[PDB]
Design an enzyme around this catalytic site. Structure first.
Site, PDB file in Angstrom:
ATOM      1  CE  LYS A 155       4.374   2.022  10.687  1.00 59.35           C
ATOM      2  NZ  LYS A 155       3.808   3.373  11.038  1.00 59.35           N
ATOM      3  CG  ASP A 214       0.604   7.684  10.461  1.00 62.16           C
ATOM      4  OD1 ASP A 214       0.743   6.468  10.806  1.00 62.16           O
ATOM      5  OD2 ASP A 214       0.545   8.063   9.259  1.00 62.16           O
ATOM      6  CB  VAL A 273      -0.883   0.056   1.262  1.00 60.38           C
ATOM      7  CG1 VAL A 273      -1.736   1.322   1.272  1.00 60.38           C
ATOM      8  CG2 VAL A 273      -1.739  -1.194   1.380  1.00 60.38           C
ATOM      9  CB  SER A 313       6.819  -1.024   3.889  1.00 59.66           C
ATOM     10  OG  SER A 313       7.754  -1.791   4.626  1.00 59.66           O
ATOM     11  CB  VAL A 314       1.255  -0.185   5.221  1.00 57.16           C
ATOM     12  CG1 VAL A 314      -0.116  -0.829   5.448  1.00 57.16           C
ATOM     13  CG2 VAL A 314       1.695   0.645   6.416  1.00 57.16           C
TER      14      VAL A 314
HETATM   15  O1  LIG Z   1      -6.884  -0.859   0.899  1.00 56.49           O
HETATM   16  C1  LIG Z   1      -6.090   0.021   0.586  1.00 56.49           C
HETATM   17  N1  LIG Z   1      -5.297  -0.093  -0.492  1.00 56.49           N
HETATM   18  C2  LIG Z   1      -5.410  -1.258  -1.358  1.00 56.49           C
HETATM   19  C3  LIG Z   1      -5.079  -0.840  -2.777  1.00 56.49           C
HETATM   20  O2  LIG Z   1      -6.226  -0.140  -3.294  1.00 56.49           O
HETATM   21  C4  LIG Z   1      -5.850   1.122   1.399  1.00 56.49           C
HETATM   22  C5  LIG Z   1      -5.577   2.373   0.839  1.00 56.49           C
HETATM   23  C6  LIG Z   1      -5.302   3.449   1.664  1.00 56.49           C
HETATM   24  C7  LIG Z   1      -5.348   3.273   3.055  1.00 56.49           C
HETATM   25  C8  LIG Z   1      -5.618   2.029   3.601  1.00 56.49           C
HETATM   26  C9  LIG Z   1      -5.854   0.950   2.779  1.00 56.49           C
HETATM   27  C10 LIG Z   1      -5.643   1.751   4.962  1.00 56.49           C
HETATM   28  O3  LIG Z   1      -6.663   1.252   5.409  1.00 56.49           O
HETATM   29  C11 LIG Z   1      -4.546   2.090   5.786  1.00 56.49           C
HETATM   30  C12 LIG Z   1      -4.390   1.331   6.943  1.00 56.49           C
HETATM   31  C13 LIG Z   1      -3.342   1.545   7.823  1.00 56.49           C
HETATM   32  C14 LIG Z   1      -2.382   2.547   7.546  1.00 56.49           C
HETATM   33  N2  LIG Z   1      -1.304   2.858   8.310  1.00 56.49           N
HETATM   34  C15 LIG Z   1      -0.924   2.249   9.451  1.00 56.49           C
HETATM   35  C16 LIG Z   1      -0.558   3.037  10.524  1.00 56.49           C
HETATM   36  C17 LIG Z   1      -0.116   2.488  11.723  1.00 56.49           C
HETATM   37  N3  LIG Z   1       0.257   3.150  12.848  1.00 56.49           N
HETATM   38  C18 LIG Z   1      -0.335   4.331  13.199  1.00 56.49           C
HETATM   39  O4  LIG Z   1      -1.209   4.867  12.544  1.00 56.49           O
HETATM   40  C19 LIG Z   1       0.070   4.924  14.327  1.00 56.49           C
HETATM   41  C20 LIG Z   1       1.297   4.947  14.810  1.00 56.49           C
HETATM   42  C21 LIG Z   1       1.402   5.623  15.975  1.00 56.49           C
HETATM   43  C22 LIG Z   1       0.263   6.138  16.407  1.00 56.49           C
HETATM   44  S1  LIG Z   1      -0.803   5.742  15.311  1.00 56.49           S
HETATM   45  C23 LIG Z   1      -0.024   1.106  11.799  1.00 56.49           C
HETATM   46  F1  LIG Z   1       0.371   0.614  12.852  1.00 56.49           F
HETATM   47  C24 LIG Z   1      -0.367   0.282  10.726  1.00 56.49           C
HETATM   48  C25 LIG Z   1      -0.805   0.849   9.540  1.00 56.49           C
HETATM   49  F2  LIG Z   1      -1.148   0.060   8.537  1.00 56.49           F
HETATM   50  C26 LIG Z   1      -2.532   3.298   6.368  1.00 56.49           C
HETATM   51  C27 LIG Z   1      -3.610   3.093   5.492  1.00 56.49           C
HETATM   52  C28 LIG Z   1      -3.592   3.997   4.368  1.00 56.49           C
HETATM   53  C29 LIG Z   1      -5.012   4.372   3.828  1.00 56.49           C
END
Ligand SMILES: O=C(NCCO)c1ccc2c(c1)C(=O)c1ccc(Nc3cc(NC(=O)c4cccs4)c(F)cc3F)cc1CC2
Ligand SMILES: CCCCCCCCO[C@@H]1O[C@H](CO)[C@@H](O)[C@H](O)[C@H]1O
Ligand SMILES: CCCCCCCCO[C@@H]1O[C@H](CO)[C@@H](O)[C@H](O)[C@H]1O
Length: 328
Positions: free
Chosen positions: A43, A158, A26, A27-28
């Protein structure tokens, strides 16, 4: 103890439990948790314990995620490591709900209905009240940090590029109020309502220029909270901008929207509406329930002032991974 399997993703080997399948960057990475039937986000932390700064930030992030249990805040579903002991503990994975998109992918430069804007912003604010009640500030709230559903259920990411940023963050003020996040909300809300960026500065100074054009020059009450006379004299030197009328930029908006925005985008952070106050604003009458806007349990941030050794941070983190109970 689960059984793991390895694989190349994001230019690195990921060793994760069997249960998580269909990893896609999506490193995630998005995945499917076959044991619970949820789409999830995994992540992998970037070199979690190479340095003391890395190790503390790894620990900070895990501490924050273990604490947050709120519908509009991203919470923690699993935390794992392929290591069998502290001795060989070198990698960290955090699992959360996969939402599918961010507020950018949603809005897509289009204008939302007023009802839709209420529901989105109410959720943001409901989430911010929670996090602010734990004495955490986001500091960098923006559309790409708000994860959203097909159903438009929202979760903040975040907490604890420069278009949504409070003017004092940009000016290195250093004593932030929780209303820095409120400024960001105002910027987001106005964009949802019009389809365009409220302040699309070309660079640092143009951003501050566009803000002042809208909100006008700083007032007298504000000026007397500014120590530097050079900073002060530069300000009183500029053309004297009156605050703009909020109608002109928002023509045909719900006047309750314009009211709330006027209360959010106030230069003086002390005079901005707070998250809890905003939830009780009339703009939100249809979603507001005073008995379902919860606060957080108190959050022990005493580790923040500590200076410890890398092996101490790494061990504290190992302990929290090992004590993790998946939620219900
Ligand atoms: O399904 C998606 N893409 C597939 C391709 O179309 C998609 C597209 C965009 C997004 C998500 C999922 C989505 O659901 C998503 C989920 C989590 C994420 N970030 C994330 C963030 C964090 N940590 C934090 O947010 C925090 C850290 C400290 C305090 S909070 C984590 F631990 C795991 C994570 F995966 C970013 C995102 C980014 C927005
Ligand atoms: C040109 C931009 C001028 C920005 C003025 C922003 C004033 C921000 O507001 C200031 O925030 C500080 C903490 O962040 C508080 O301590 C001050 O009391 C408050 O006035
Ligand atoms: C575009 C130029 C705007 C410059 C405004 C800078 C004034 C902010 O200066 C801030 O003042 C605070 C209170 O006096 C001090 O505590 C902070 O150290 C300082 O960052």
């Amino acid at each position: 103890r689960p059984t793991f399997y390895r694989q190349e993703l994001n230019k690195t080997i990921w060793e994760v439990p069997e249960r998580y399948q269909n990893l896609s960057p999506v490193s995630v990475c998005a995945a499917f948790d076959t044991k619970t039937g949820l789409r999830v986000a995994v992540k992998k932390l970037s070199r979690p314990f190479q340095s003391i700064i890395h190790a503390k930030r790894t620990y900070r992030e895990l501490r924050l995620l273990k604490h947050m249990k709120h519908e509009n805040v991203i919470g923690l579903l699993d935390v794992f490591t392929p290591a069998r002991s502290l001795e060989e503990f070198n990698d960290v994975y955090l699992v959360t709900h996969l939402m599918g998109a961010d507020l950018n992918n949603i809005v897509k430069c289009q204008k939302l209905t007023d009802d839709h804007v209420q529901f989105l912003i109410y959720q943001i604010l409901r989430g911010l009240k929670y996090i602010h009640s734990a004495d955490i500030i986001h500091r960098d709230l923006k559309p790409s940090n708000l994860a959203v559903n097909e159903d438009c259920e929202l979760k903040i990411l975040d907490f604890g590029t420069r278009w949504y940023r409070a003017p004092e963050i940009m000016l290195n003020w250093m004593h932030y109020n929780q209303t820095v996040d409120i400024w960001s909300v105002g910027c987001i809300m106005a964009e949802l309502l019009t389809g365009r960026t409220l302040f699309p500065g070309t660079d640092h100074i143009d951003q501050l220029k566009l803000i002042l054009r809208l909100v006008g020059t700083p007032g007298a009450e504000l000026l007397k909270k500014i120590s530097s006379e050079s900073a002060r004299n530069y300000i009183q030197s500029l053309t004297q901008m009156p605050k703009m009328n909020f109608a002109n930029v928002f023509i045909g908006a719900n006047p309750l929207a314009v009211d709330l925005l006027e209360k959010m985008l106030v230069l003086d952070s002390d005079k901005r509406i707070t998250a809890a106050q905003a939830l009780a604003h009339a703009y939100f009458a249809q979603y507001h329930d005073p008995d379902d806007e919860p606060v957080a349990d108190p959050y022990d941030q005493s580790f923040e002032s500590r200076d410890l050794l890398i092996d101490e941070w790494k061990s504290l983190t190992y302990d929290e991974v090992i004590s993790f109970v998946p939620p219900p």
